[model samples]
Every structure is written in C-alpha cells, then in structure tokens.
Target: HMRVLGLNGWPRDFHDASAALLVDGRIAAFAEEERLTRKKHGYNTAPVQAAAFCLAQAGLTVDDLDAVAFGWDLPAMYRERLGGWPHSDSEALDILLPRDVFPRRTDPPLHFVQHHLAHAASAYYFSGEDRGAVLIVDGQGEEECVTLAHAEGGKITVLDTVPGAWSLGFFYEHVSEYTGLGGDNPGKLMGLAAHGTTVDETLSAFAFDSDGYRLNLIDPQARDPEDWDEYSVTERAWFAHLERIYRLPPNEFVRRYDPAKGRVVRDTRRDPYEYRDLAATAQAALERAVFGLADSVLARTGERTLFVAGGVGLNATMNGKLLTRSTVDKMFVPPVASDIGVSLGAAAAVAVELGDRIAPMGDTAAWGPEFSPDQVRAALDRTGLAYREPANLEREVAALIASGKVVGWAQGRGEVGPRALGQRSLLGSAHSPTMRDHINLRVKDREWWRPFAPSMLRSVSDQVLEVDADFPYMIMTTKVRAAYAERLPSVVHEDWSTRPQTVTEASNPRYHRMLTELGDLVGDPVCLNTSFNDRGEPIVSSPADALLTFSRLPIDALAVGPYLVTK
Candidate 1:
C-alpha cells in the first residue's frame, strides 16, 4: 500500500520551526527545528532537512510522498488578520512559495491547515475515545477555530466557539511572562506557588473568587480578556493594574539575535520592579480561571467524562485540579498536548473528512521517530565514552535513582510533547522539596518556578495521588494525596498537586520497570522526571546528543545506550 505522511513541522529552535511526520495518517515521526542548530524556532530549519529526514525514515524520497502538510494558514494569519483588525495593518499574504524551506522538493501535495483546526483534530484523533465530549483551547484560534466540536461517534460536530482574544492559553503565557520566569514557563509558576505564602485570591482579583461562583477553567469554553497583550496597546495605561506591570520590548527575537529560543535576555531592567510579580499573579489567575472553566464544563455537561486539547491542555496542574473541582470521572489528554499535535490533526481531519473510522490508538505519544539500536550503537561508539550494558536495563537505572544519582535515560519511542514522560528523560528521586530546586537551579539551569513531573506506577498511582485518571503522558495534575505530599514533595507543585505520568506495562514497560525497581529501593513508586537537555537545546535524540548533554550539565551520571556516562 502506498503511504501517507503527516508532518508537524515544529520550529527548529525552541525559538523557530516545528514539524511532524504522519505516515499512513498516523504520526510516525516528529522533531524540533533546534535539533540541528542554535536557532530555536527552526528560524533557520530548512524545510528540506525535515522533509528529507522524514522521507528517508519512511524508506522513500520526497518524490515518493503523497502529501505534505504545514500547521498554519499564512494567508489567514497574515492577509486576513484573523481577529479584530483595522484591515490595513493585517494585510493579505505575499505570493511567495514557502518552497524556499524545502531541500529537493519535487512538489508534494502541500496544504496549509488552519492552526486551530489542526490543534483540535490532533487531540480528538489521538484521544482513542469512541464518542465523547471534546474541545480545543489554544494560544490563538485565528477565527478559524477556538472552542470546537461537541464530539461523538468518532465524528465531531462543531458548536458555539470564541476567538483567540478570549484565550486562557495566551493569558497563561502572559502570566508566565508577568511572573518574570518568561511566558513559556508556566510550569515554573506551578512550582513557585509552593515557594511563598498563598495570597488572598480576593485581594489579587486575578486568581480569586471568594463567591460561591465556580471556576473558569473547568468550563468547556470560557471567554476572558484578562490575558490579552495589553502592553502593546494600552501603552502603560493601567499597566500597574496588572501584576508586576512590567515591560521589555521584544528585543530577543527581533534585534539582539540569540539562536537558542528559551534564553532570558539579560538586557533591559530599567523598569521599577526588578522581579515579575505580575507574571506570578497572572499564573495564579490562569490556574484558577482554567480550573473554574473546567468545573463549569463538568457541572453543565453532566457528561463528567472530559477530553481536552490545545496548548493550554498541556497544563497538567489545571487538569489535576479539574479531577476534584470539575467533578469529571475520567480525562484524556494526549502527550503532544500543544500546537505541534495539530499536524496530526490536519491529517486526521483529512482522513475523517475523507470517511475513515478514527483508528483509536489509545493515546501513545511514542509516536515520534527514534534511533534504531544500530543507530544508537553507532552514535555511542563515536562518542568514545565508557558505558555499561546493564544486565537488566531497568534494574540498574532504578538503582542509580535510588542511590540519588541522576540518570539521563532514553528508550523506545520519544513522546510527542514538551513534558518528558520517560523515553527521553533525566530521572531522579522525589524525596526532597530541594529536588525541584535542585533540578531548576542546577540540572536545568532554568528559572526557579518550573516544576518537575512524577512517573507513578499505574498499579499504585492512587497511593501517591488523589485522582483516578491514568495520565500516561504526564498532561494533568492530581493533588498528591495528603499523606504523601511531604513524602513526594519534589513532584508536587505549590498546590499540593502533581502532573504525574501513570505508567502501565503495556504503554511504557521500560519506564515502568525502572519505576518498579526504584520503588523497591526508594520505598516509593514515583521518580522525578525532566526532559533530557540543557535549557537551550532540544531533547536529546541520539546517544551522542545524550553524551553531549552530559558534558554540558552537572549531572551525576547518565545511562544512555549501553554505557553509563558520569561526571
């Protein structure tokens, strides 16, 4: 049978380009733009590199490909100005072919799917749900899609929707920026909330609702302008009204030129607040708002079963709160819970639109490309680093963690989202609150607010956490049970919650085994897991990348491929 491909085209740098490869309409491989270079956004990731790598893995050239998909409607984003616009500032598309991005492009069927639809379809298709409630909330919908699909029967139908201005996702990002940790690091804010005393939600006005009123997060579709980019328009008007009322022009990507996407530009600190109180407040508000929305949705839907997609869905802390607040019995949030998943959604949208049963794969994010053992051995050999082929891959790694040693463990298929589940991760213990501080300050070299995830044994998640949903991909937070919060404080965020990966034998046995062994040693089935990379690079794909990261970070040891790399 001839094959089909769905490419996500993720931005190369955490800064620039991103893409995905969906073979036979299922996500076969996906990657970031930065894997190849310093430019984070794939700002320099040529389409050719992505196209070629994908075609080679599928054992065919680009000429053999049937379809190629990108994740935006440039015409809509540029020409149409998707939202409230004066029409002139947001002019139409320039008639230039994005082909300059491809290497040896013998014209495949290139289609630019709308960003919102792509995000929605990606989540719905991956959800393995037969027929249930669904909605897509993202950074921006561009009028194409915002809140979508009251789905059932493997076919979703649209209902009431809103635009990006009412975005909870964007609001969270704004808060991330406001908190001084930067916009993309909301996970950090989750960790930060635990660092200080809880402020009265009422005085803050951003995160509180002392009233008996429900939260905004649990609502199926909420509309609030609290997160809009007010700094751009209001121009310091009511600036202080927002928390930390801070301002620093977009100089990083626009001028001073940094290739890595996630770096904090050390320039521009003349403003009054040296810190980011606004951002902290915004993050607090976002969690409460999103939680409120979820609660409303669950209360109204009566269909307590929940399915959430979009960039905001990546907030596992909010989802964990949803379990108790939303009154939802079950939740399904795929690993690639961000915009990158849209590429799969575009392909799936095409598939179901073309009349096909949504082949339910039960949410496995090991959907991206991985190194062949041959490739792994070759990379390991070239690194010339001493390593150990553990008699038992799982047992030895777990022993490393039990001994309080950090392990840069990589195995099986890489997960498709930002939060590292297991395949590409750095594993450690969860016994100390200092564990979160240790990872943020030393391991990640990142902002302090970023939180860590827990990989809990499926057989015993209820023992550590209060929720029942199996969050295999680490996308939702469950309040760590009262008894275990102090026991596993490393994984729990400020809210007494955790975005834990519930592991089973079938989904991730290698990881499950590691956890089992660690559990035997540590007396806990939970391990603190973070992505395997420095702050500026993409998660390590090859063993060489793993070795290089080891050389760069302050890790104690790494079990990449057959060798155990140590400082």
Candidate 2:
C-alpha cells in the first residue's frame, strides 16, 4: 500500500493553505490550515498543523509516507515568468521539509504538480465520471489563469489555456474591492449583485468570444516600485484603473464597534447602489465569460460531462447558471473547489502517476479530523457548561429548532473547504421570517443584505427546488420553486434563488435524521444553515471551539456529538 501526503502553501504568500493524505488511493484525511490555526485564509502560513493532523488522523507517521505532493510547480513558475515577487526553491523547501513539519528522521520524495493541473485533477478524478471536460480558472497560476482540459481513462489532456494577464479572477477581485467588500470577498459582491441592475458600460470591460475572454481593465504585470506594499500593488493599480473608467468615487466604509450590540458594525450608507450596480455588471460579465469558455471546451472535447475547479468554481451562482443554461448533461464541482482542494488534487495526481487506482469520493465532503467520545466529553467538562447526553439527540435538537431556538450543531468529522456542510453548522427554523436578520446582525455580525443557505432533505428537493438533481454540497445556487419560496423565507435570497445542501442518509446519517425529524414537526424538512462561528472567526473545528462560540454568541443551545449543551 502506498501513502502520499499532499500540500499547498508555496511562495509563502498564498492564501488557503491546506493538506491532504491518501492511503492506497483513498482520501484518508483533508483539512485547511485555517481551521486548526483559527486564522481566516491561513495567509502566508504553511500547512504544518494541517499535515500533522492528516497524518495523525490516518494513524500514520512521516516514515510511512511514500511521497509528498505539492500543489505548485516552483521550477515551472521561476523558469518562465517572475511577477516582481521574490520566491526561491530553497525557501519553498525550507517550509516543506518533513523534519520541519513533523518529528521524523526519514524524508519522502516530494513531487510538484502544476497549479491548474492540480485543480483539474481534484474535480475530474473524484467526479466518478470516466470521461469529462475540465475547467480551471483562478486569479493566476504558474503562468496561466484559465485552463480547459479533457480527462479520459485516468489521464488528462490540456485543450486550451489563457494567460494570467487577462485573468477573470483578478477582475472580479477588483470589483469586490471597489464595492468595499475587500479583495478577498467576491462572494459578498455576488450577493450584492442581486440587488442592482447591470450596466452596459461595466460589462464592456470584458471582451468575450467563443474561444476565451479577456479583461481589458487592469494589467496585473504593471508594477510600481514606489508602492511600498508589494503584496497589494496589483490592487492599487486596479483601483486607479477603476477610478479612471467609472469616473465615480469608490464606495466608502465605516467600521465601528457597537457597545450595545457587543459587535463590530459596518456602515455603507454612502453611494451604495452605484457600487452594487457595478458588482452586478461585473458578475454578469464573469458569467458570460465562463459560460462561453465552457461551451467552447465542451464543443472541442465533445463531452457532456463537465468538471470545474479553481477559485472561480466557488461561485455558486455562476455554477448554477452553467448547469442550467449550458449544454452539459452532467456537471460536478467539489465542495473544496477553491485552492484548499488543490492539496487533494495534487496528491491524487501523484498517486495516479505511481499507478494507483484512485476511487471516487461520492456525496460527502467531511474528511477532516474526527474527535473521540472521550475528547468531546473532556472539552465539555473543561468548559463547565451545562450539557446533557440526550437519549434522542436528533429529535431533541429538532424540537429545539422548531421552538425557534438557534442551535450550534457540530458532529463527527469537520468539513473541508469554505462552506460548512452540516458537520459544523448553525441550524434554525427556515420558516422563521426574522431568523435571517437575527443571525446576520446578532450571531454572524455581518451585512444585513447577506443571504443564508438551507439544508433540505433529498426527498423534498423536487418540491422545493426547480431542478431535480443531487446537490449534496452547497456549492451551487438554484431557483426555489415559487410555491415553496415563502415557506423557506430565511434561506431564500432576494432573487428567489437559494444555495441548498440536499441531505441524504448515505451522505450524513445524523444530519439527515435530524432533518427528517424536523419535517414531522414542521411542514417541510428544511432548516436554515450557516457556518458555526461568530463574526471574523473561522468555522469551529473542535468541541471546545463550539462551546466557546455558543457561550459568547446569542445561540440558545449547542449539539456537539451526542451531548446537548444549553445556555
């Protein structure tokens, strides 16, 4: 049996550092460094803790590992282009050495996979489809930002690639920053897009065609030596370009800590709709460009099955539009579609190169750390909170939710990636009209206009959603049926679309049982779901983290493992 450990966090400045382990071609464990370190994005940090956790979870040591796979090809990067950033091979090796990351005497051979190829393999290999077209799009990889490929018979062939100079990811990031949501918050810009009308001039920034598209607004390579902040020089350039193009002032933001509410509040009362309209136009442009690229690649490969991964693949709205609007017969996007998933992809690619048979990861994405019963109890005891082991935990939690109590639910293994899918979540009654506002303002302490998601039983998916497909992950948004839109008020967006996690017994038994029990009490088996964390914090990964968040937040109760804690 071969064991491989995969990692991401090279150049020492990348975000979403993560690690994954594969034992005999099956994923043993995967986790983002942010979860273990409590740092959002895990920027500029190595995946040492994440790698150690993966090894521990699999009951393996560094000596047992046959190889280590990294998600980026440093040699390929330095060979062709240097984007004014200082990175060297020795520095990357300093962070990736086995002895540095773990207490081991043996060193495993390390393999480097290209960034876009890692993303392509992460989706196509785990998609369970024998043959499909793969699409990878992000801000910038080693050289290219967009890659279209065909995967068949356990091999991938690159069909086309677009240079990083015309990256759509950076374009969207520019729009996100201009809208006062910060450069890393493109999802927020997407939410704001629904509130405004798209402008033709904003859409004109992108030139789209059948083969590919180009962003004419900002030049990523244009650098200024006078700018002291090297990391955000591109952002500054984009800001200047935006000012020249739009001729409108950038949106202003005021952040203040409200003593009464015990949270930080964001004020964006000045010139809101102009930036929102620009966000809408940028989102529309992104959709058009990606759809065109997908159609072109599908025609070239003549494949109905499509697999997508990259930072842009995390755009649930774009993925939904592609699924319903394109000519694809089948589509798959991994729950860890962003850079966090590239670790798994890199490991899978290395395993394939070693002639191992990689199995498909079906339905579930909860492949992180799983705490033991004793560990959970110890954490609860340390907190000194009033907790009880309910005989029927699912039924009791369902009852609590039906009674209009928001519950922090943490069960089994933690979920990998940005979205929390039942493993670590906040659950409440979807029928509660004010629940969305309550969670946004009080619990999450974010913008009021931000939308929440839903976790619904697969049995009622056809009745609630317009599409009849398995959306086991909340990575895509679909239209809520008009008949059931009002019923799921807390989850539905202003556009009548909802991002849903369709729960099945095979995917998550406990969460499915809880939703089924809730259906008996309520009319539908739907519950409003969001990540289990307070504002500015990563999703809770441990029982202690869960209890701490519940104690501080306005949550009424917490269901962690078999124990239920009430405030």
Candidate 3:
C-alpha cells in the first residue's frame, strides 16, 4: 500500500492548516494545523508536522510516499483568477518541468475551476451526492464574490458566481472596520446584529438586490479613491459615507475596535442595541437577496439538493432563512466554508484531474491522520498528564456528558473541516436557555449574542431542526420549533435558528450511537455542539493539545480515546 499527503492553508483559526493522507482516494488520516503547531489556524509550517505525522500513522516516510499532493493547484487558481493569464501555460509547465515532465497540450485545462468550485468539489466529491446544485461562497476568490455550482453524480458544473470586489463579507468587514470594530471580525458583526433592529436606508438595502438570473452584487461599494491602503481606495469610501451619516470620523464614530486586542471588542459606547438592529437588518437584507439568488439557480437547474461552501455561506442566520424559505428540497455545506476549506478543494481538484471516481459525500470529517493507541498513550506520556484508564470510551464519555458537564470529545482522526461535529467537539446539554450564554461566555469567550450550533442524530434531526434530511456538514442553520426551542436552548439562537450537523449512522455511526444514547437519557437528540477550542485558538489536535486547551479553558472534561480528563 502506498500513501499520499495533502495540506491546505485555511486562515480562519489563526492560520488553520490541514494535513492529510489518502490511500486510493479514500481518507486515511487527517490533522488540522492549529492542533499540531499549537498556533490556532496554523501557518504554512504544518507541512513538516503533518507529513511526519501521516507517515508515522502509516509507517512510511516522505521518501516512501507514492505521490504527494498539495491541495489546489495554485497556478491554476492564479491563472483562472486573472482569467487566462498568458503565462498560465509556462507556469504550469514549470511545475511539471522541475521533474523534467512536459505536458502534451499547449493549452491548460479549459475549465477555469472557480475558487468556490474547489470548495464545491471538496464537499461534493466526498458528499456522495449523486446529483445536486452546489454553492461556494467565501472571502476573496478570483472573480467569484459568492459562487454557486451544479454537481450531479460526481460531475460538477458551475452555474453562477459573483465577484469578490462587491462582497457581502467585505461589506460586513468594512462596517466593522469603519465602526472601528476592525477587520477579520465577521462574527462580531454577527453578534452585533442580535442587539439591534433593521435601520432603514442606512447602507442601501438596494445593493443586495432580489433580481433573478442577473448577477448578485451585495453591498457594492462606490468606485472611488482613498489614498491610504489599496483596499481603502475601493472599500474605504463607504466608511466615509458612514461618517457622513454618523457625523463623525470613520474610526472615531462608533464603539469598540480596540487597538490592543487587534481584536474587535464589543462597544458599549453607543446605542449598541440600535447598532445591532442595523446589523441585523443588513443581515436580513443579505439573506433575502441570497434566497432569491439560490431560488433562481435552483429553478434554472431543476435540482433539489444544494451544497454550499464560502465565507458568506457561514452566516447561520442567512442559512436558516434558506432552509426554511427556499423551494430547493435539500442542501449541504462543508464545515470549512472559507479559504480554510480550500485544502479539501485543492485535494479534490487534483484527484479530479487524475480521473478518480471520488464520492461526493464523505462519511465524516475525521479525514485526517490518526494516532494509534500507542501514539495516544505516548503523547500523554510526553505531556505528563495522568489519567484513569477506562474500560469503555463511548459509555464513559456519554455518562459524563449526561452529568451536565462540557466535554472535549476527541476520538479517531480529527475532522476535515472547521466545525467540530462530534469527532472533535466541546459539547454540553441544550436543556437550559442559559446554556447558550454560558457556553458562549465561559468556554468560547465569545459574544453572548452569538448562537451555538447543534449536532443531532440524523435519525431524529427533523424532530429537532426544521430540516427533513441530513446536513452532513454543520454549514446551514435551521430553526427549531417553538415547542422544541426550550429543549435545545443552548444550541438555539435568539431567532430560534441553529446550524445543525445531522449525523447519521452511515456518516459517523459511533458518534450517532453516542448521541442516540444521550437521546435516550434526555428524550431529545439535540446537543450543544461547538468547536473544541476557545476564541483565537485552533481546535486541539492531540491528547496533549487537548490537555493544553483544557488547562487554558474552564470546560469540565476532555475525552481522548479511553481516557477522560477534566478541564
């Protein structure tokens, strides 16, 4: 048996990187860069650690590898972004000619696989969706601001894509930055939406249009000049307009964008409640526009299932709208929606080129490398944490979970995408309305207004969320019935929405079985599921990594294989 290695540079969790192994196009093991390097959203350095780890798992070395691959052919991405970069041929040739290999044709692959398409493939290839329309929405990919594609029986076709220059995500970040909130803080914007109501005529709700078949350019900023940074020239002009409306300088106008935190702190300085309403209104507008766009695409394609991947796709509020309002029958989103998910996309693109019949539906996100029992024990030994040996892992963790404790459950290989769907998760009961606040306040160190996600057993997903079928990835949000909201209060949002991970027996039988057992005790299948780490930190990678996180956070316990350690 031969082994292959893959790495992706997704920047969500402080350089969130991923390393993985593929044996015959099937995932062998995977690891996120954050957990291994102890740098959240790890940097470019994951290659060394990832390669070594993958090799160790399969008892092979880099020299022993059959063929190693990097996710995304960067040259292809660059070429397509520039749209037929004349040097595309020469650059692609260079990638091969380093090994003295030459391509047969002068022209490269005709299909310009959009950035989102890679995301579409990353999910769809592993999704097992024989036929469906897919959506790829994320930050800064070539021409597509937000992208949607159609995939059927493993073949993917691009239907439509919007431009990044007129990005909804960019507008949110601009609002954040203009309000002195700072860049890279979409979650803050999301949190801000909760405390406010929709303000009329603030930023033209008109920019986010409801037109069908036409291109969607949400929050399109005016083309003007700002002498500072390049982005200021295009995006910063809006901030000036915001200044006009607020009667203040762009930076000084609003509340909390702390220079020290380099992190956006929440502002109590202004009418935050009012600001929240404005933000919520913007979100609502974006949602309305996106729903229209998705519907139009669905009608044209005549496909029932939609798979979405992108930064905008991460908006749970909008996702909740699509789930409940759309004519589309089903949907799926990769948990790694942004550039972080590109690793999977990159890998899938390479495989697609190789003509491998990769399945569209992957069973689980635990596609990373695995540490054997010996490896786990060795890591613990190295870390110097002592734990009681358990006779049963699943049973023990389930019992602890039922005892009102937040458990960091790390079993098998790490999940492939951003969300911690069961394999690597910080879980608690959703029984109390305060549970959401508690988890957000305590473990996550997040805004109290932001919502928690739910991971439910697929068999009973409909009983909890509004979805009728499974959402393999924790991408889309759905509302719980008013009657059931109290049952999963921790996981439910103020809008009664949740981005749900509907785990089925087929996808992750062990995780489903655990939830099933918990369901028996709680009489409901929903659980308060959040990623396995705190703010600004990447999800933990190993027993030692988990221990380090546990020491840092106030969570109750962490389960790694047969051992359960208290945080």
Best by TM-score: 2
Model 3 has an lDDT value of: 0.63
What is candidate 3's lDDT per residue for 239-314, written digit by digit as tens?
A: 6555665543454443466899787665534433335655676566566667767776677678877776777777
Model 1 agreement with the true structure over 1-567: per-residue lDDT tens digits = 334445444222222244555555555556554554434435423334444455566676555655555555544544443354223311211111133433343555656676666666676676676544565666665452246455566666655464443455655655445444556555555556555443444223343443112223223233334332222222221223343333443212223545696654553333213333443444455666655555555454446666778777876656666666536666677666676566566667666654654555553566445776677878777878666676787888888787777889877666656767788899888876577788889887876666677887888887787766677777776677778898987777656767778888888777887889888988888899989999757787666777788878888888765456666
lDDT of 1 at 101: 38
Model 2 spans > 4 angstroms off: 79-94, 97-101, 217-237, 252-274
Model 2 scores worst on lDDT over the 10 consecutive residues at 222-231
Error of 3 at 62 (Å): 6.1
Residue 485 miss distance in model 2 (angstroms): 0.9
Q: Candidate 1, which segments miss by more than 4 Å at Cα?
A: 8-16, 36-38, 41-48, 82-106, 196-240, 243-280, 291-302, 361-363, 432-434, 447-450
- Tell me the lDDT of model 3 at 485: 82
lDDT of candidate 2 at residue 532, scale 0 to 100: 97
Computed on alpha carbons, the lDDT of every model, listed in order, comes to 0.60, 0.85, 0.63
